Amino acid sequence: GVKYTCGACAHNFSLNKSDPVRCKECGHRVIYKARTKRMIQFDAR
Amino acid sequence: LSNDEVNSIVKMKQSLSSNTGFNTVLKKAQLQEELEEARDAHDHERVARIEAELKSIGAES
Amino acid sequence: EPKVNIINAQDDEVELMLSDVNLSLANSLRRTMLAEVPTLAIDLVEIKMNTSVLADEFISHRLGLIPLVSEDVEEMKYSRDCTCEDYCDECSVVLELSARHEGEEGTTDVYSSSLIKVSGPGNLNVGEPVRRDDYDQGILLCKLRNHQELNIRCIAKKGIAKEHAKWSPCSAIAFEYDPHNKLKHTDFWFEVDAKKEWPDSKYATWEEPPKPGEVFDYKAKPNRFYMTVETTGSLKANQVFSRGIKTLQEKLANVLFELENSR
Amino acid sequence: KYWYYPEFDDVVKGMYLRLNTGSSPYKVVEVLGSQRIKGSAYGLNSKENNCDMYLK
Amino acid sequence: RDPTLNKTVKIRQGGYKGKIGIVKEANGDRFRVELHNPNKTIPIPCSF
Amino acid sequence: EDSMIMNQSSIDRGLFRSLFFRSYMDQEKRFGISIVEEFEKPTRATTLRLKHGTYEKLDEDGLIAPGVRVSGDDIIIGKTTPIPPDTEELGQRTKYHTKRDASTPLRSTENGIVDQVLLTTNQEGLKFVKVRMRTTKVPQIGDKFAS
Amino acid sequence: MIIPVRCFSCGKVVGDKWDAYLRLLEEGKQEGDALDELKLKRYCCRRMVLTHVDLIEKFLRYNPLEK
Amino acid sequence: STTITSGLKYSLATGNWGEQKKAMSSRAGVSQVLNRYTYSSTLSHLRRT
Amino acid sequence: MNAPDRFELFILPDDVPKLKITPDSRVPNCIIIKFEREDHTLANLLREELALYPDVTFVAYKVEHPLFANFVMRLQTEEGTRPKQALERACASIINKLKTLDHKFNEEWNIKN
Amino acid sequence: LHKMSMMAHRVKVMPYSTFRLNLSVTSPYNADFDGDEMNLHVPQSEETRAELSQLCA
RNA sequence: UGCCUGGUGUCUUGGGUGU
Ligand SMILES: [Mg+2]
Ligand SMILES: [Zn+2]
Ligand SMILES: [Zn+2]
Ligand SMILES: [Zn+2]
């Protein structure tokens, strides 16, 4: 439901809150969430 | 998927894995550790093969 | 009664001499040119994707400082004074940047030339980032390697340098008067001799040095002012000078109107 | 996304899918089975998408 | 029950035109909106 | 008396401007054979004693996503611990509190942008998250400088 | 980290002169002569290019986190 | 194997140079968190007596 | 956190008058003028222009605090002249000076273009 | 150290995040502006306000 | 008419700030 990114091979995937925390293709134990889809605005100051 | 299934898939893709910088670095580190183990055992025959393999794998840019 | 004499003229800097004006008027003109002439600068950044090594607000701050052509900014309106919902074409200029590196080797530089004007006021010469020449790449904004992309949409608004220094058209205004210190407005620190320990002013040849037997003149006032106006390229030097004069006139006229309407 | 599953071999069995004939009129083929082929790694979708599974 | 609470909003008038925020307080006719651009929260009328 | 005057225009152009990062850690503890903590977005119905902050910035897995602006007292990690149910099963339509909130709020005086969220497993095989927050600090009256 | 867009003190745009400065230094010109050739008169501007340390070339050597 | 492992880890983690159950009367502060505020601070911390 | 908005230096609130005048009864024919959202740029110009008028016997100004954008000016003329008329004359005279300065600069720039 | 280290001032609300003092009172407090911090206590009654304004001013 | 929440460990230790 929510995307994730591996910490070594930078491979995108998704998890269902029941899979083991692991990259599907290289088996790394550290993964990162992906950026939000909301709008990000800055004041340029 | 289960943990064992994940390990099996990872091993399968490693067999399919032609090359990956992280995996190459890990392999070179493991080879260096094996080489020091052979050196401490005074095995002059294994160390030559490990040195040849390390020379072949190396030479990065 | 006031007089102007131009020494050097360029697109980016003018060196001129004012005379027959009070020191206060020249200083007010300098202050107005420094911090009260309206220009156009990026004020909102909407970051659709930023995978570079720089922080989002780092790049936003860098973008805000890029000078944009502000020739016709008089016709433009202030954002807070525009009745339109959201931003229209008459109070904002929309620029878009999209940078990407292709291939698995090398580094790509993102320059201000990549900023593309998408929308703005009709037929007004505003919004385009300033370029020295047609082949000048411009200000370096960021650097990218493989699989790093920068995709942003920036909105430029009209403002003055009082609110933020990014709207200042001038860089540094050299200002100087009385090179030979005949008015004794400064007292010269020295160790042995004050005359040979202090460098001559660059305009020392424009005024006759005082005679050895001359007495002090207590009736004299500063009369000739030498000032150099340097710009960032958003506005030409003559445009900066003329618009500073016009801004000062508008301020005084507003004060006069307030006085006359007070009764 | 699912070719490396152990059950994928029986899952793909009997399925009907659009196939590029190449010799292009797309047509439907019936899966009689699958056979892993070592040394025949091929790009599946991108360069990194190496695959050894084959569909008979 | 204040349906606009915790919803992304944009300001169309005043000194903050075109700034994205999130509504935090919805007592009435005076909405507290935190701004994404600086790190601050400001009051604002509903009409804005 | 050791003060100093700084140029506002130089500050506007980036003088002495800096970047600030703070990281938060949390992990799922194991209390027994089947008493575990869970990363989730707690609901006002099934959990009791919630923090006064807002939970609307959490994702489905109870973790905030990078790029989201956060303020003080906002909830960046959603965690619940199980509690033995009461006699509310009398007439409650499944709306009885079985879990207690153990969420991690952002510090009251701090705010910024969520920079990077890390999810992994600890030595014991339980979930383990780290959230890094980023903000920019501009010089102002009272900041300390030295030669 | 990367060359500032404007000089801190006065506000001259120095962000477009880093590449030219490096090119001039490559040809054997001295630092003072290189800064003079770029028309940087005031020493407030000269310190911006003279004392800049380019750290982004070190941050870029890390493998990008996405692809 | 837990004896040596836990003893070393505890002494390095807390800085109390001794057995865990003899925390009192043991020399404290031997192990400290590395100061990473700036490069010079780290270099100074690594050469401290 | 407590830093005020930068536009408050020049943007005038609706309820705040730009220009408030109150008499100074300690001396005859004197007024105190409070300018809002202004600084030394207008104040010094007005002060040095008014100081040269023979019918103005006292003119001064001060900025109470650098963190607030306003200044207060004290003006005191002769018996014949009302101070507000002197202020208006100063404003008009400076406007004419600026106008002729602009004209001369344009002429010189065109000549040297 | 002495009783001039606690004195009662009159509040003036100002922007930015620092307490501000006239520099003549930096001597009794033994304070300078290189990073010192000072404590402020608010009276909560009419009696206490009168005591502060009539004794410790 | 579907209707809104304040409640925050302890003990040690270590490094710092201003005198
Ligand atoms: Mg001190
Ligand atoms: Zn991976
Ligand atoms: Zn508009
Ligand atoms: Zn400079």
PDB file of all heavy atoms in Angstrom, chain C residues 161-190:
ATOM      1  N   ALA C 161      13.765  45.843  -1.740  1.00  0.00           N
ATOM      2  CA  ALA C 161      14.849  45.266  -0.955  1.00  0.00           C
ATOM      3  C   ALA C 161      14.670  45.462   0.540  1.00  0.00           C
ATOM      4  O   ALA C 161      15.428  44.883   1.319  1.00  0.00           O
ATOM      5  CB  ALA C 161      16.185  45.858  -1.387  1.00  0.00           C
ATOM      6  N   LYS C 162      13.709  46.281   0.959  1.00  0.00           N
ATOM      7  CA  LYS C 162      13.395  46.363   2.379  1.00  0.00           C
ATOM      8  C   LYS C 162      12.877  45.032   2.895  1.00  0.00           C
ATOM      9  O   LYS C 162      13.213  44.613   4.007  1.00  0.00           O
ATOM     10  CB  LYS C 162      12.361  47.456   2.630  1.00  0.00           C
ATOM     11  CG  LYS C 162      12.931  48.793   3.009  1.00  0.00           C
ATOM     12  CD  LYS C 162      11.811  49.728   3.386  1.00  0.00           C
ATOM     13  CE  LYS C 162      12.322  51.087   3.788  1.00  0.00           C
ATOM     14  NZ  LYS C 162      11.200  51.997   4.150  1.00  0.00           N
ATOM     15  N   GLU C 163      12.048  44.357   2.100  1.00  0.00           N
ATOM     16  CA  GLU C 163      11.463  43.092   2.526  1.00  0.00           C
ATOM     17  C   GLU C 163      12.487  41.969   2.516  1.00  0.00           C
ATOM     18  O   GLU C 163      12.526  41.151   3.439  1.00  0.00           O
ATOM     19  CB  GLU C 163      10.283  42.749   1.625  1.00  0.00           C
ATOM     20  CG  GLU C 163       9.453  41.596   2.121  1.00  0.00           C
ATOM     21  CD  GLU C 163       8.091  41.558   1.474  1.00  0.00           C
ATOM     22  OE1 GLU C 163       7.844  42.383   0.571  1.00  0.00           O
ATOM     23  OE2 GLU C 163       7.269  40.706   1.866  1.00  0.00           O
ATOM     24  N   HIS C 164      13.318  41.904   1.480  1.00  0.00           N
ATOM     25  CA  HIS C 164      14.354  40.889   1.385  1.00  0.00           C
ATOM     26  C   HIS C 164      15.402  41.381   0.407  1.00  0.00           C
ATOM     27  O   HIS C 164      15.083  42.057  -0.570  1.00  0.00           O
ATOM     28  CB  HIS C 164      13.776  39.545   0.940  1.00  0.00           C
ATOM     29  CG  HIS C 164      14.707  38.391   1.123  1.00  0.00           C
ATOM     30  ND1 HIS C 164      15.808  38.185   0.321  1.00  0.00           N
ATOM     31  CD2 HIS C 164      14.699  37.374   2.016  1.00  0.00           C
ATOM     32  CE1 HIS C 164      16.438  37.094   0.712  1.00  0.00           C
ATOM     33  NE2 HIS C 164      15.787  36.582   1.738  1.00  0.00           N
ATOM     34  N   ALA C 165      16.659  41.038   0.677  1.00  0.00           N
ATOM     35  CA  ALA C 165      17.767  41.552  -0.114  1.00  0.00           C
ATOM     36  C   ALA C 165      17.785  41.023  -1.539  1.00  0.00           C
ATOM     37  O   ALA C 165      18.560  41.528  -2.354  1.00  0.00           O
ATOM     38  CB  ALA C 165      19.091  41.217   0.560  1.00  0.00           C
ATOM     39  N   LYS C 166      16.971  40.020  -1.857  1.00  0.00           N
ATOM     40  CA  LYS C 166      16.967  39.469  -3.203  1.00  0.00           C
ATOM     41  C   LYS C 166      16.313  40.399  -4.213  1.00  0.00           C
ATOM     42  O   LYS C 166      16.502  40.212  -5.417  1.00  0.00           O
ATOM     43  CB  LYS C 166      16.256  38.123  -3.212  1.00  0.00           C
ATOM     44  CG  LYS C 166      14.766  38.225  -3.028  1.00  0.00           C
ATOM     45  CD  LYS C 166      14.164  36.879  -2.731  1.00  0.00           C
ATOM     46  CE  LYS C 166      12.679  36.996  -2.530  1.00  0.00           C
ATOM     47  NZ  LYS C 166      12.087  35.711  -2.101  1.00  0.00           N
ATOM     48  N   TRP C 167      15.555  41.390  -3.759  1.00  0.00           N
ATOM     49  CA  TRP C 167      14.911  42.339  -4.652  1.00  0.00           C
ATOM     50  C   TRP C 167      15.729  43.603  -4.861  1.00  0.00           C
ATOM     51  O   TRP C 167      15.219  44.559  -5.446  1.00  0.00           O
ATOM     52  CB  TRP C 167      13.529  42.721  -4.125  1.00  0.00           C
ATOM     53  CG  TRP C 167      12.460  41.708  -4.366  1.00  0.00           C
ATOM     54  CD1 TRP C 167      11.968  41.318  -5.567  1.00  0.00           C
ATOM     55  CD2 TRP C 167      11.700  41.010  -3.377  1.00  0.00           C
ATOM     56  NE1 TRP C 167      10.978  40.390  -5.395  1.00  0.00           N
ATOM     57  CE2 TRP C 167      10.789  40.188  -4.056  1.00  0.00           C
ATOM     58  CE3 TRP C 167      11.712  40.988  -1.983  1.00  0.00           C
ATOM     59  CZ2 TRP C 167       9.902  39.358  -3.392  1.00  0.00           C
ATOM     60  CZ3 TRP C 167      10.831  40.165  -1.329  1.00  0.00           C
ATOM     61  CH2 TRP C 167       9.938  39.362  -2.029  1.00  0.00           C
ATOM     62  N   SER C 168      16.963  43.639  -4.393  1.00  0.00           N
ATOM     63  CA  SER C 168      17.793  44.825  -4.546  1.00  0.00           C
ATOM     64  C   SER C 168      18.374  44.880  -5.951  1.00  0.00           C
ATOM     65  O   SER C 168      19.010  43.911  -6.384  1.00  0.00           O
ATOM     66  CB  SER C 168      18.911  44.821  -3.520  1.00  0.00           C
ATOM     67  OG  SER C 168      19.667  46.013  -3.597  1.00  0.00           O
ATOM     68  N   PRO C 169      18.188  45.965  -6.691  1.00  0.00           N
ATOM     69  CA  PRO C 169      18.737  46.030  -8.048  1.00  0.00           C
ATOM     70  C   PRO C 169      20.218  46.366  -8.068  1.00  0.00           C
ATOM     71  O   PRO C 169      20.938  45.955  -8.979  1.00  0.00           O
ATOM     72  CB  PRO C 169      17.907  47.134  -8.699  1.00  0.00           C
ATOM     73  CG  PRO C 169      17.561  48.028  -7.578  1.00  0.00           C
ATOM     74  CD  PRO C 169      17.415  47.170  -6.354  1.00  0.00           C
ATOM     75  N   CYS C 170      20.681  47.110  -7.071  1.00  0.00           N
ATOM     76  CA  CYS C 170      22.066  47.545  -6.985  1.00  0.00           C
ATOM     77  C   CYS C 170      22.890  46.551  -6.183  1.00  0.00           C
ATOM     78  O   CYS C 170      22.375  45.844  -5.316  1.00  0.00           O
ATOM     79  CB  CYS C 170      22.171  48.920  -6.334  1.00  0.00           C
ATOM     80  SG  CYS C 170      21.081  50.158  -7.023  1.00  0.00           S
ATOM     81  N   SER C 171      24.187  46.504  -6.480  1.00  0.00           N
ATOM     82  CA  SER C 171      25.105  45.725  -5.659  1.00  0.00           C
ATOM     83  C   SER C 171      25.773  46.605  -4.608  1.00  0.00           C
ATOM     84  O   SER C 171      25.542  46.435  -3.409  1.00  0.00           O
ATOM     85  CB  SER C 171      26.152  45.040  -6.539  1.00  0.00           C
ATOM     86  OG  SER C 171      26.958  45.985  -7.205  1.00  0.00           O
ATOM     87  N   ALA C 172      26.573  47.571  -5.039  1.00  0.00           N
ATOM     88  CA  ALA C 172      27.244  48.461  -4.103  1.00  0.00           C
ATOM     89  C   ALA C 172      27.333  49.839  -4.725  1.00  0.00           C
ATOM     90  O   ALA C 172      27.808  49.980  -5.855  1.00  0.00           O
ATOM     91  CB  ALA C 172      28.640  47.949  -3.748  1.00  0.00           C
ATOM     92  N   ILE C 173      26.889  50.846  -3.991  1.00  0.00           N
ATOM     93  CA  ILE C 173      26.879  52.219  -4.469  1.00  0.00           C
ATOM     94  C   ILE C 173      28.035  52.936  -3.791  1.00  0.00           C
ATOM     95  O   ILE C 173      27.951  53.302  -2.615  1.00  0.00           O
ATOM     96  CB  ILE C 173      25.546  52.915  -4.188  1.00  0.00           C
ATOM     97  CG1 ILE C 173      24.413  52.185  -4.902  1.00  0.00           C
ATOM     98  CG2 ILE C 173      25.606  54.352  -4.642  1.00  0.00           C
ATOM     99  CD1 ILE C 173      23.146  52.975  -4.973  1.00  0.00           C
ATOM    100  N   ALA C 174      29.124  53.133  -4.527  1.00  0.00           N
ATOM    101  CA  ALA C 174      30.214  53.957  -4.035  1.00  0.00           C
ATOM    102  C   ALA C 174      29.742  55.397  -3.924  1.00  0.00           C
ATOM    103  O   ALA C 174      29.063  55.905  -4.817  1.00  0.00           O
ATOM    104  CB  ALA C 174      31.419  53.860  -4.962  1.00  0.00           C
ATOM    105  N   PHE C 175      30.086  56.050  -2.823  1.00  0.00           N
ATOM    106  CA  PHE C 175      29.624  57.400  -2.547  1.00  0.00           C
ATOM    107  C   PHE C 175      30.766  58.151  -1.891  1.00  0.00           C
ATOM    108  O   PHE C 175      31.457  57.596  -1.037  1.00  0.00           O
ATOM    109  CB  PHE C 175      28.386  57.370  -1.650  1.00  0.00           C
ATOM    110  CG  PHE C 175      27.816  58.714  -1.342  1.00  0.00           C
ATOM    111  CD1 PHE C 175      26.878  59.284  -2.170  1.00  0.00           C
ATOM    112  CD2 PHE C 175      28.195  59.395  -0.203  1.00  0.00           C
ATOM    113  CE1 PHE C 175      26.345  60.508  -1.883  1.00  0.00           C
ATOM    114  CE2 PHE C 175      27.662  60.620   0.088  1.00  0.00           C
ATOM    115  CZ  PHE C 175      26.736  61.178  -0.751  1.00  0.00           C
ATOM    116  N   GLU C 176      30.974  59.398  -2.295  1.00  0.00           N
ATOM    117  CA  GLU C 176      32.177  60.106  -1.897  1.00  0.00           C
ATOM    118  C   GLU C 176      31.993  61.593  -2.148  1.00  0.00           C
ATOM    119  O   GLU C 176      31.348  61.990  -3.118  1.00  0.00           O
ATOM    120  CB  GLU C 176      33.386  59.572  -2.668  1.00  0.00           C
ATOM    121  CG  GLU C 176      34.601  60.457  -2.641  1.00  0.00           C
ATOM    122  CD  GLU C 176      35.867  59.692  -2.928  1.00  0.00           C
ATOM    123  OE1 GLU C 176      35.791  58.663  -3.632  1.00  0.00           O
ATOM    124  OE2 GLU C 176      36.937  60.118  -2.452  1.00  0.00           O
ATOM    125  N   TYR C 177      32.562  62.404  -1.264  1.00  0.00           N
ATOM    126  CA  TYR C 177      32.576  63.844  -1.468  1.00  0.00           C
ATOM    127  C   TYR C 177      33.767  64.432  -0.735  1.00  0.00           C
ATOM    128  O   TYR C 177      34.310  63.826   0.190  1.00  0.00           O
ATOM    129  CB  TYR C 177      31.272  64.492  -0.997  1.00  0.00           C
ATOM    130  CG  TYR C 177      31.098  64.546   0.498  1.00  0.00           C
ATOM    131  CD1 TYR C 177      31.509  65.649   1.222  1.00  0.00           C
ATOM    132  CD2 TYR C 177      30.498  63.507   1.179  1.00  0.00           C
ATOM    133  CE1 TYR C 177      31.344  65.704   2.578  1.00  0.00           C
ATOM    134  CE2 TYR C 177      30.328  63.557   2.538  1.00  0.00           C
ATOM    135  CZ  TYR C 177      30.756  64.657   3.231  1.00  0.00           C
ATOM    136  OH  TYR C 177      30.587  64.712   4.588  1.00  0.00           O
ATOM    137  N   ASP C 178      34.170  65.622  -1.171  1.00  0.00           N
ATOM    138  CA  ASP C 178      35.255  66.386  -0.571  1.00  0.00           C
ATOM    139  C   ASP C 178      36.537  65.571  -0.466  1.00  0.00           C
ATOM    140  O   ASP C 178      36.957  65.226   0.644  1.00  0.00           O
ATOM    141  CB  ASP C 178      34.849  66.885   0.812  1.00  0.00           C
ATOM    142  CG  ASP C 178      35.727  68.001   1.299  1.00  0.00           C
ATOM    143  OD1 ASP C 178      36.406  68.624   0.462  1.00  0.00           O
ATOM    144  OD2 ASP C 178      35.739  68.257   2.519  1.00  0.00           O
ATOM    145  N   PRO C 179      37.183  65.245  -1.585  1.00  0.00           N
ATOM    146  CA  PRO C 179      38.393  64.414  -1.514  1.00  0.00           C
ATOM    147  C   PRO C 179      39.530  65.026  -0.718  1.00  0.00           C
ATOM    148  O   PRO C 179      40.313  64.284  -0.115  1.00  0.00           O
ATOM    149  CB  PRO C 179      38.774  64.237  -2.988  1.00  0.00           C
ATOM    150  CG  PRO C 179      38.131  65.371  -3.681  1.00  0.00           C
ATOM    151  CD  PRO C 179      36.849  65.600  -2.971  1.00  0.00           C
ATOM    152  N   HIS C 180      39.659  66.348  -0.700  1.00  0.00           N
ATOM    153  CA  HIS C 180      40.799  67.004  -0.076  1.00  0.00           C
ATOM    154  C   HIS C 180      40.531  67.468   1.344  1.00  0.00           C
ATOM    155  O   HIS C 180      41.402  68.099   1.945  1.00  0.00           O
ATOM    156  CB  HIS C 180      41.250  68.192  -0.923  1.00  0.00           C
ATOM    157  CG  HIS C 180      41.953  67.793  -2.178  1.00  0.00           C
ATOM    158  ND1 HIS C 180      43.199  67.209  -2.176  1.00  0.00           N
ATOM    159  CD2 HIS C 180      41.581  67.883  -3.475  1.00  0.00           C
ATOM    160  CE1 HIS C 180      43.565  66.957  -3.419  1.00  0.00           C
ATOM    161  NE2 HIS C 180      42.601  67.358  -4.226  1.00  0.00           N
ATOM    162  N   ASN C 181      39.353  67.179   1.890  1.00  0.00           N
ATOM    163  CA  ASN C 181      39.036  67.469   3.284  1.00  0.00           C
ATOM    164  C   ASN C 181      39.144  68.958   3.592  1.00  0.00           C
ATOM    165  O   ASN C 181      39.724  69.357   4.602  1.00  0.00           O
ATOM    166  CB  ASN C 181      39.925  66.659   4.224  1.00  0.00           C
ATOM    167  CG  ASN C 181      39.297  66.444   5.572  1.00  0.00           C
ATOM    168  OD1 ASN C 181      38.080  66.450   5.705  1.00  0.00           O
ATOM    169  ND2 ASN C 181      40.127  66.249   6.587  1.00  0.00           N
ATOM    170  N   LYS C 182      38.590  69.794   2.715  1.00  0.00           N
ATOM    171  CA  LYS C 182      38.575  71.224   2.992  1.00  0.00           C
ATOM    172  C   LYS C 182      37.534  71.580   4.038  1.00  0.00           C
ATOM    173  O   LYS C 182      37.675  72.592   4.730  1.00  0.00           O
ATOM    174  CB  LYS C 182      38.313  72.011   1.715  1.00  0.00           C
ATOM    175  CG  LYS C 182      39.332  71.794   0.631  1.00  0.00           C
ATOM    176  CD  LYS C 182      38.770  72.248  -0.691  1.00  0.00           C
ATOM    177  CE  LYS C 182      39.827  72.238  -1.763  1.00  0.00           C
ATOM    178  NZ  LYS C 182      39.252  72.577  -3.091  1.00  0.00           N
ATOM    179  N   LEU C 183      36.480  70.780   4.154  1.00  0.00           N
ATOM    180  CA  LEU C 183      35.438  71.032   5.135  1.00  0.00           C
ATOM    181  C   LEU C 183      35.806  70.537   6.521  1.00  0.00           C
ATOM    182  O   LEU C 183      35.082  70.830   7.476  1.00  0.00           O
ATOM    183  CB  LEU C 183      34.137  70.370   4.692  1.00  0.00           C
ATOM    184  CG  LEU C 183      33.678  70.714   3.282  1.00  0.00           C
ATOM    185  CD1 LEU C 183      32.645  69.724   2.819  1.00  0.00           C
ATOM    186  CD2 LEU C 183      33.114  72.107   3.253  1.00  0.00           C
ATOM    187  N   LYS C 184      36.907  69.799   6.649  1.00  0.00           N
ATOM    188  CA  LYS C 184      37.331  69.222   7.920  1.00  0.00           C
ATOM    189  C   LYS C 184      36.222  68.382   8.539  1.00  0.00           C
ATOM    190  O   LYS C 184      35.955  68.458   9.738  1.00  0.00           O
ATOM    191  CB  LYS C 184      37.797  70.306   8.891  1.00  0.00           C
ATOM    192  CG  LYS C 184      39.155  70.885   8.556  1.00  0.00           C
ATOM    193  CD  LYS C 184      39.562  71.934   9.570  1.00  0.00           C
ATOM    194  CE  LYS C 184      41.006  72.352   9.372  1.00  0.00           C
ATOM    195  NZ  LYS C 184      41.934  71.199   9.505  1.00  0.00           N
ATOM    196  N   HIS C 185      35.559  67.577   7.708  1.00  0.00           N
ATOM    197  CA  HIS C 185      34.527  66.685   8.219  1.00  0.00           C
ATOM    198  C   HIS C 185      35.111  65.433   8.843  1.00  0.00           C
ATOM    199  O   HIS C 185      34.398  64.720   9.551  1.00  0.00           O
ATOM    200  CB  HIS C 185      33.558  66.298   7.109  1.00  0.00           C
ATOM    201  CG  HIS C 185      32.438  67.267   6.930  1.00  0.00           C
ATOM    202  ND1 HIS C 185      31.396  67.053   6.055  1.00  0.00           N
ATOM    203  CD2 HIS C 185      32.201  68.466   7.509  1.00  0.00           C
ATOM    204  CE1 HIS C 185      30.563  68.076   6.107  1.00  0.00           C
ATOM    205  NE2 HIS C 185      31.030  68.949   6.981  1.00  0.00           N
ATOM    206  N   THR C 186      36.384  65.144   8.592  1.00  0.00           N
ATOM    207  CA  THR C 186      37.057  64.019   9.218  1.00  0.00           C
ATOM    208  C   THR C 186      38.412  64.478   9.731  1.00  0.00           C
ATOM    209  O   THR C 186      39.026  65.400   9.192  1.00  0.00           O
ATOM    210  CB  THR C 186      37.213  62.840   8.250  1.00  0.00           C
ATOM    211  OG1 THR C 186      37.723  61.704   8.955  1.00  0.00           O
ATOM    212  CG2 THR C 186      38.161  63.184   7.130  1.00  0.00           C
ATOM    213  N   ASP C 187      38.865  63.831  10.798  1.00  0.00           N
ATOM    214  CA  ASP C 187      40.145  64.125  11.425  1.00  0.00           C
ATOM    215  C   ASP C 187      41.047  62.912  11.258  1.00  0.00           C
ATOM    216  O   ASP C 187      40.678  61.805  11.655  1.00  0.00           O
ATOM    217  CB  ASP C 187      39.963  64.462  12.902  1.00  0.00           C
ATOM    218  CG  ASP C 187      41.242  64.910  13.560  1.00  0.00           C
ATOM    219  OD1 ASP C 187      42.148  65.376  12.838  1.00  0.00           O
ATOM    220  OD2 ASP C 187      41.345  64.809  14.799  1.00  0.00           O
ATOM    221  N   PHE C 188      42.224  63.121  10.680  1.00  0.00           N
ATOM    222  CA  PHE C 188      43.018  62.021  10.157  1.00  0.00           C
ATOM    223  C   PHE C 188      43.970  61.483  11.217  1.00  0.00           C
ATOM    224  O   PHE C 188      44.852  62.203  11.694  1.00  0.00           O
ATOM    225  CB  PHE C 188      43.780  62.469   8.914  1.00  0.00           C
ATOM    226  CG  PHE C 188      42.974  62.376   7.662  1.00  0.00           C
ATOM    227  CD1 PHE C 188      43.069  63.339   6.683  1.00  0.00           C
ATOM    228  CD2 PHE C 188      42.100  61.330   7.474  1.00  0.00           C
ATOM    229  CE1 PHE C 188      42.317  63.247   5.539  1.00  0.00           C
ATOM    230  CE2 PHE C 188      41.350  61.238   6.333  1.00  0.00           C
ATOM    231  CZ  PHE C 188      41.455  62.194   5.367  1.00  0.00           C
ATOM    232  N   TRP C 189      43.782  60.219  11.574  1.00  0.00           N
ATOM    233  CA  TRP C 189      44.700  59.515  12.454  1.00  0.00           C
ATOM    234  C   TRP C 189      46.056  59.378  11.779  1.00  0.00           C
ATOM    235  O   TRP C 189      46.140  59.144  10.573  1.00  0.00           O
ATOM    236  CB  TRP C 189      44.123  58.140  12.790  1.00  0.00           C
ATOM    237  CG  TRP C 189      44.889  57.335  13.774  1.00  0.00           C
ATOM    238  CD1 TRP C 189      44.637  57.218  15.105  1.00  0.00           C
ATOM    239  CD2 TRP C 189      46.017  56.500  13.504  1.00  0.00           C
ATOM    240  NE1 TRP C 189      45.547  56.373  15.685  1.00  0.00           N
ATOM    241  CE2 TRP C 189      46.406  55.921  14.721  1.00  0.00           C
ATOM    242  CE3 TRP C 189      46.741  56.194  12.351  1.00  0.00           C
ATOM    243  CZ2 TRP C 189      47.483  55.054  14.817  1.00  0.00           C
ATOM    244  CZ3 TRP C 189      47.808  55.340  12.453  1.00  0.00           C
ATOM    245  CH2 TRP C 189      48.169  54.777  13.673  1.00  0.00           C
ATOM    246  N   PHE C 190      47.123  59.523  12.559  1.00  0.00           N
ATOM    247  CA  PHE C 190      48.461  59.455  11.991  1.00  0.00           C
ATOM    248  C   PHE C 190      49.458  59.083  13.076  1.00  0.00           C
ATOM    249  O   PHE C 190      49.164  59.151  14.271  1.00  0.00           O
ATOM    250  CB  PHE C 190      48.854  60.777  11.329  1.00  0.00           C
ATOM    251  CG  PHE C 190      49.042  61.909  12.294  1.00  0.00           C
ATOM    252  CD1 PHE C 190      50.302  62.249  12.745  1.00  0.00           C
ATOM    253  CD2 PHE C 190      47.963  62.642  12.739  1.00  0.00           C
ATOM    254  CE1 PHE C 190      50.476  63.288  13.628  1.00  0.00           C
ATOM    255  CE2 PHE C 190      48.135  63.681  13.618  1.00  0.00           C
ATOM    256  CZ  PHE C 190      49.392  64.002  14.064  1.00  0.00           C
TER     257      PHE C 190
END
